[PDB]
Design a protein around this ligand. Sequence first.
Ligand SMILES: NCCn1nc(-c2ccnc(-c3cnc4ccccc4c3)c2)cc1C(=O)O
Length: 264
Amino acid sequence: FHVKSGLQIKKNAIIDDYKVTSQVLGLGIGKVLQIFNKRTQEKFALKMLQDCPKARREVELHWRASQCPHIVRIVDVYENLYAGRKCLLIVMECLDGGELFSRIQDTEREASEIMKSIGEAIQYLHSINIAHRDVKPENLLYTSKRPNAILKLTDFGFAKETTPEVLDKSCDMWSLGVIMYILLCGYPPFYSGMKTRIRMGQYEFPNPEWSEVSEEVKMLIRNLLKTEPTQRMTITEFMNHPWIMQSTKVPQTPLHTSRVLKED
Ligand SMILES: NCCn1nc(-c2ccnc(-c3cnc4ccccc4c3)c2)cc1C(=O)O
């Protein structure tokens, strides 16, 4: 009988429990500040919203999704006044490693593992009927600069509850597709009309980036970047796909991604 706790929105001053600093760890809707837990002294990330109903949706949905290992954990949520302005302050696990591609710029097998982790993130969300939507790289961060460090998904501002016929997340699978692409070659499939080339499904696999790359991956990216959503791959299928399912038995084929990101 495994029952996790509910969302306690603490009403007391946040400054009673943490010391809020200035250092901004990200801007994204509303700066994200680094703060320290008075009791433990661990670093945490604080997100501050105006207490409207959209903002209570983010909290709710993030919180529900927080148990997933590859989704930035929420540690507590506060309702405070601030210049006569009711607010939702979210406290999250501090992901020190920084943004996915920054860390890149410093192999196929490595590509896969990263993609696996991001899949589990979506798999979880989908299995509890949450679409994330805004699954860009800017919202994919590592827990530490350490190489074993693990990749976790953030930012639920655009997340939405989806709640087989007689019983929206399709676009998360697009994001995955795109994120896969960039990991391999090092640049988007739709370089800068770009809006008109996306609607056509108009992208190449130009060499030398994609010369050494597998047909197995190609066809997977292809299914992920299908223009028509209903044609596009499901999360469940994605995770059953051998390339993703078997990261322990995948090619260690080198790609010049770090080179390209440092380039552009
Ligand atoms: N993705 C940008 C916006 N955004 N960033 C965060 C976030 C959450 C947790 N940790 C960080 C974080 C912490 N330390 C860092 C140190 C260096 C570089 C980036 C860092 C990012 C950032 C949350 C949100 C959000 O939920 O809106």
